Design a protein around this motif. Structure first.
Motif: not given
Lengths: 146, 128, 60, 297, 330, 152, 331
Positions: G209-212, G217-218, G225-228
């Motif tokens: 999801l983060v990769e998306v 958004f660059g 932010i992945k940690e939360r």
DNA sequence: CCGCAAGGACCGCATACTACAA
């Protein structure tokens, strides 16, 4: 969602009329019920339905049973108005307009406070919304009749 | 419409907007007199929100408590506190007077008929 | 098959009630940027059919 | 003596060292409130009262010196605080006056505590102080008193209806005057012109209403907190142990700075100042006023 | 979109501050305002604007506003409203409207609400430095990564208008907080291991110097640097929850001099020495005198009026609560 | 369909308050003391801390604040009304933090069965903060039902 | 198969202050609620709210010649280049606020006076929730989302895929008491997360999801932010968006009495800060034209350069610091 | 060491509450 509004309005008109009937010459009682009806949704918004019902409970015990409440047997206007509002709100959530009507409650006769302690979060949320809605109707008729 | 009302002697007022809507209100002749002399008329023409709320929600009103709900909407839409109390009492009385001359089966249809009439004569596009 | 688990069939009167009173009713305005407030005659209400509605048309 | 600290693991050993004077601590309210010693007085009975805590030290004198040694380490920071406080006072053109404790002072004796007793100590600087709420309160209750002793018969006669609600001596009059000022202040028109002297200044009931305000109008006078001068924190103990059960007090001879300010065009800070000065002399502030505590000179 | 200038209002508490949020059915009867998802104490923009507006109003009605000469609103209203000036003055005197410049900056009172929007945007007051009791150093000025990150984002907003990783048991702190040769700091009930760093505190102090200068609300900025600590977000959350001021208050029954029935309650306060900041954005007025007819002029009036001023925020004003020192950094 | 912790708090609070009223229906002193101590408890926690509060209760029972498991405490074995009430409150609070409202409820505690005071004196500050907030939350509900049900 | 548009841009919106996109007063305990999709209960910002914000900003930028096209955009000169003879009268209309500058009307449509001339070139979609901030027992707060939100994001990617004709551009199941969450949220030795008033069991997706989010958004996330990140069930997520918004009591104080005035007490709802929303901005061929902006690609470029990394204010209560968001506009 | 252990006011007010062409 329209018929439920009519049901709420019917209940609201009835309970406010009972207040005005029993305490016609007592403007203090009528005014107290009105104020508490206005404050009630706020208490629910900031503390939740459970705490609000508990708060009403402290204004009156052996068991949590709205049926056993007797508002007219209290000494001052504050407690009388509180006991009435508490019973009205609880009656609506538990009984509605009776089992001969479209809406017969959400808790099937069970006291809403104990109901909250036992059922699911979903059950509590609908009871919260419904409580806010009936108080909203009570506030309407209170302002116009009391 | 008018001649189909029991006892007839009825004014049927229709407003067909350019956009397409068609509002109809059936009233007794005395409604015209009461309205023109009413404080409600001077207040409305001194609005749409009051009329909208009543028309949108009248079907949710309890049959036994129509009058009380009228009291409420007057309190909510009509407002010094001295003039506020007087205007509310007067306008409520005028509404109750007007309702006597609205054609309808029940109190609900009378309320709908009256505020349909008010919606017609307050239409800013029709009465600029 | 996923849709099957979330279909609710209700009575005709109840369905009609929802289709008439559960559609989106949205207030829109026009702002007079000169004053930064809502312009004269700049308020109206518009109805919307919600997303996730299924309709069908027969093309003869 | 055996001492136990019911706190998180790493804090417990440091709290041990602090109370044993093996490590220096710079904040008084911190070591008192968040590092409470539980002292094994006897058998398996642990106690957290000041009476038991005192046993950690050689004597009562040793205990006092420790507390004040910790307290005084905020002197440098407190001086800046007090200076800004004075700047605050003068920005509101406050009536500033200083009074000295004539007897022992203990404000906030009843704040909930494992010690069973307490005292209002500043969170950051540790100094004892008097909340504006108490200063405003004692001034208003003193106003209630003077009006009762001098105009009790008339006030009880004019407001017989209010008297019935309360209920027939002085203590009934004081309660009646309070209810008038607190609840039925719309009815004060009858005795609005009634005046009182304290001591050479004339204060009317109507002035008292504006000074303290009502539910319908904010008070016209600001009652600030009262703090001890920095010079005393440097020179003398601001705290000493007293006995009823041990409890902390402010010693006699401690000078405090007070301030009241007008926030209306009426400029009633002068009347409020004179009213507060008299209150601090005759009534006193804090707990145990019936024993002479809290008096100012 | 008319915002051309932004000024930061630093708010340093001298007395405890109670920005209330309404009563609750709990031990803390009157809690302070908090951001819900973080639990961080705040002062909402509307709470701060009301205080700024009230002050500015009282100063304008007393001809104490400078624009570097005095401001006469009644005279400037006559030049603006002309024939309807005498009518407007009667409205202000009847408290139906507010004086001219107040309505220009903060927007009109109720009766003129639809005439135009307010010229300024009063941002929510955010926590920047929270005072925490310290074993060594008396008390520390504490912040966290989230706070610093928000401070950074707010600067990216200001510059647009004008056109650290810590675990729960770690801290970056000045020397005055660190125990003698232990590399540990004790803040409230928490023991923290000192993390070696050489940029975080330094840059933070540089930021404060850019905004407030060497004068840090009555003290040299160098004095503060030695007592600045950054802690983890979890730890900062615990501090702002359990190290606020919880004050027991009573109402005394004059009958016996005892606490009245239901005359005992608890109120929450931000402690003294709390540093909060608010972004005050300024745009072109929409109502007007040439003295204050643009963004730069409004900014100058806002700065001089409120810089170094003492303001009361929140409740309990007459018992001496809510008084802060204001610095207007441009 | 899940439940919220608030539901479990209210449930647990009603259960423990009803348990006292049942075991001491003729004893208004025990009931009155428990209500007083439930009312006092959150304030002590805010000023002195949760650990100091739990230890404060144990010291009233003259138990060693370092060598006591909450399960071993039986409130029905004390003479005076004070120690009975303190034992109940300590027991109820500890049980909540240790076991919640049951292993199959929507909240089964925070300390995983470990004695809360021993837990506090063994774990980190963040663990204590989470338990402290939860202690305040359950006590708020105990106070609610104590105020309405327990007599003086 | 979406040939009415040729290109599309996703407008990411991150709130840095609470946001009140209003729907109007209600007879309810919450007097002023925020905008919501009625059949899901999810908070939204209607496209017409966002379009009004984008239009007003774009318009002011064009009037101040701050618009970048390919160099500076001089709208008066380009107006004379297009309208030629009757260009002078058009400019006079603009200065009188009767019409809007050239590029503004091309992109967003004519001012109300010239409504019948042509339609706007861009379609401003409703903003929908992607990440919603929820307080956590550990880690302070969590960025919460759900499968139905992830699904709607994938479907919007399918829209972009169909529009840009890029087939290359084109499974999360959770129980109600379960969550997929970052390490910062998980309680020490329990494998559980407590969000608001709900205990959730940790399940062994976020990285993907983060990769998306990194695509749209660059590499940086709005300059943070992945940690939360916490993924919860659809109904739990729904309850959060509906009952974990800021509800604030506001008052009007009588300036003389220092007390609350009549008609001066109401409750107002706010979308919290740290909320991530997004709107799909579709661009079609201009319907009004200078060569600098004569096709879809050129209009997209102007939109991207103008609003990427910019700050906007959306909703009401701007004067009390509400509605401030940071925008990321990616293709 | 003991006791207590909130209450009422305000309660969304006002403005804008279609405009215009095709």
């Amino acid at each position: 969602i329209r018929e439920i509004e009519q049901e709420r309005a019917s209940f609201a008109f009835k309970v406010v009329s009972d207040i005005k009937d029993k305490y016609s010459q007592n403007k203090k009682v009528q005014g107290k019920y009105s104020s508490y009806a206005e404050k009630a949704p706020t208490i629910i918004l900031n503390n939740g339905l459970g705490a609000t019902l508990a708060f009403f409970l402290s204004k009156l015990i052996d068991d949590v049973d709205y049926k056993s409440i007797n508002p007219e047997s209290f000494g001052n206007a504050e407690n009388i108005a509180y006991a009435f509002l508490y019973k009205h709100l609880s009656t609506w959530l538990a009984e509605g307009n009776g089992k001969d009507s479209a809406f017969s409650g959400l808790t099937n006769g069970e006291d809403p406070l104990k109901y909250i302690m036992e059922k699911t979060a979903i059950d509590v949320a609908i009871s919260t919304e419904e409580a806010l809605s009936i108080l909203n109707w009570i506030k309407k008729f209170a302002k116009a009749m009391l | 419409k008018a001649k189909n009302v029991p006892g007839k002697d009825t004014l049927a007022i229709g407003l067909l907007k350019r956009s397409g809507s068609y509002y109809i209100s059936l009233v007794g002749w005395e409604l015209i007199r009461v309205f023109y002399n009413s404080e409600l008329r001077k207040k409305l023409l001194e609005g749409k929100r009051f009329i909208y709320h009543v028309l949108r929600e009248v079907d949710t009103w309890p049959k036994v408590g129509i009058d009380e709900m009228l009291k409420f909407e007057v309190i909510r839409h009509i407002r010094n506190k001295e003039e506020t109390k007087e205007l509310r009492e007067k306008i409520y009385g005028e509404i109750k007077d007007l309702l006597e001359h609205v054609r309808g089966n029940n109190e609900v249809e009378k309320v709908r008929g009256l505020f349909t009439f008010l919606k017609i004569i307050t239409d800013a596009e029709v009465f600029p | 098959e996923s849709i099957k688990e979330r279909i609710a069939i209700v009575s005709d009167d109840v369905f009609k009630s929802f289709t008439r009173f559960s559609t989106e009713i949205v207030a829109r305005v026009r702002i007079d940027a000169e004053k930064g407030t809502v312009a004269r005659g700049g308020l109206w209400y518009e109805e919307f059919l919600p997303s996730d509605t299924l309709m069908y048309s027969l093309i003869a | 003596v055996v001492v136990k600290y019911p706190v998180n693991s790493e804090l417990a050993n440091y709290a041990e060292k602090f109370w044993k004077k093996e490590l220096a601590i710079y904040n008084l309210s911190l070591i008192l409130n968040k590092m409470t010693p539980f002292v094994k007085r006897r058998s398996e009975s642990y106690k957290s009262s000041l009476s038991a805590v005192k046993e950690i030290f050689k004597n009562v004198d040793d205990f006092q010196n420790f507390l004040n040694s910790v307290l005084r380490r905020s002197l440098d920071e407190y001086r800046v605080f007090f200076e800004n406080y004075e700047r605050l006072f003068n920005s509101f053109s406050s009536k500033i006056f200083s009074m000295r404790t004539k007897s022992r002072l203990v404000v906030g004796l009843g704040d909930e505590s494992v010690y069973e007793t307490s005292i209002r100590l500043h969170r950051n600087y540790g100094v004892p102080y008097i909340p504006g709420s108490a200063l405003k309160g004692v001034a208003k209750h003193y106003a209630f008193s003077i009006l009762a002793r001098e105009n009790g018969d008339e006030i009880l006669r004019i407001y017989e209806s209010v008297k019935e609600d309360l209920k027939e001596d002085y203590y009934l009059t004081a309660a009646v005057i309070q209810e008038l000022f607190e609840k039925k202040f719309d009815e004060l028109g009858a005795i609005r012109n009634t005046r009182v002297e304290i001591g050479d200044t004339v204060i009317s009931v109507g002035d008292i209403v504006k000074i303290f305000g009502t539910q319908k109008e904010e008070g016209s006078v600001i009652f600030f907190d009262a703090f001890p001068t920095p010079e005393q924190l440097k020179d003398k103990p601001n705290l000493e142990l007293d006995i009823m059960i041990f409890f902390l007090t402010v010693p006699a001879g401690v000078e405090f700075t007070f301030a009241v300010a007008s926030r209306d065009l009426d400029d009633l800070a002068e009347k409020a100042e004179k009213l507060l000065k008299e209150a601090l002399k005759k009534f006193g502030v804090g707990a145990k006023t019936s024993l002479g505590y809290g008096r100012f000179d | 979109d008319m915002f051309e200038k932004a000024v930061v209002f630093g708010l340093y508490s001298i007395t405890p501050v109670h920005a209330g949020s309404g009563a609750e059915l709990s031990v803390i009867d009157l809690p302070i305002q908090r951001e819900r998802h973080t639990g961080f104490p705040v002062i909402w923009g509307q709470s701060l604007k009301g205080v700024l507006r009230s002050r500015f109003r009282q100063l304008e009605l007393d001809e104490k506003i400078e624009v570097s000469q005095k401001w006469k609103w009644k005279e400037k209203t006559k030049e603006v409203l002309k024939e309807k000036a005498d009518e407007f003055i009667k409205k202000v005197e009847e408290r139906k409207r507010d004086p001219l410049l107040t309505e220009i900056v903060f927007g009109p009172a109720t009766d003129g609400a639809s005439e135009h929007a307010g010229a300024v945007s009063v941002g929510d007051a955010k926590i920047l430095l929270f005072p925490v009791r310290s074993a060594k150093g008396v008390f520390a000025f504490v912040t966290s990564p989230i706070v610093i990150q928000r401070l950074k984002e707010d600067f990216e907003l200001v510059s647009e208008i004008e056109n650290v990783e810590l675990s729960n048991n770690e801290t970056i702190a000045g020397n005055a907080l660190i125990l003698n040769g232990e590399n540990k700091v004790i803040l409230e009930d928490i023991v923290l291991k000192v993390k070696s760093d050489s940029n975080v505190i330094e840059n933070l102090v540089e930021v404060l110097k850019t905004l407030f200068g060497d004068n840090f609300f009555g003290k040299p900025i160098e004095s503060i640097k030695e007592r600045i600590a950054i802690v983890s977000d979890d730890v900062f959350k615990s501090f702002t929850r359990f190290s606020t001021e919880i004050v027991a208050r009573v109402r005394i029954d004059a009958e016996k001099g005892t606490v009245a029935r239901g005359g005992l309650w608890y109120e929450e306060f931000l402690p003294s020495d709390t540093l909060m900041y608010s972004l005050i954005a300024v745009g072109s007025p929409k109502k007007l005198p040439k003295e204050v007819d643009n963004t730069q002029k409004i900014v100058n009036v806002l700065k001089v009026t409120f810089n170094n001023a003492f303001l009361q925020i929140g409740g309990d004003e007459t018992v001496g609560k809510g008084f802060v020192k204001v610095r207007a950094g441009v």
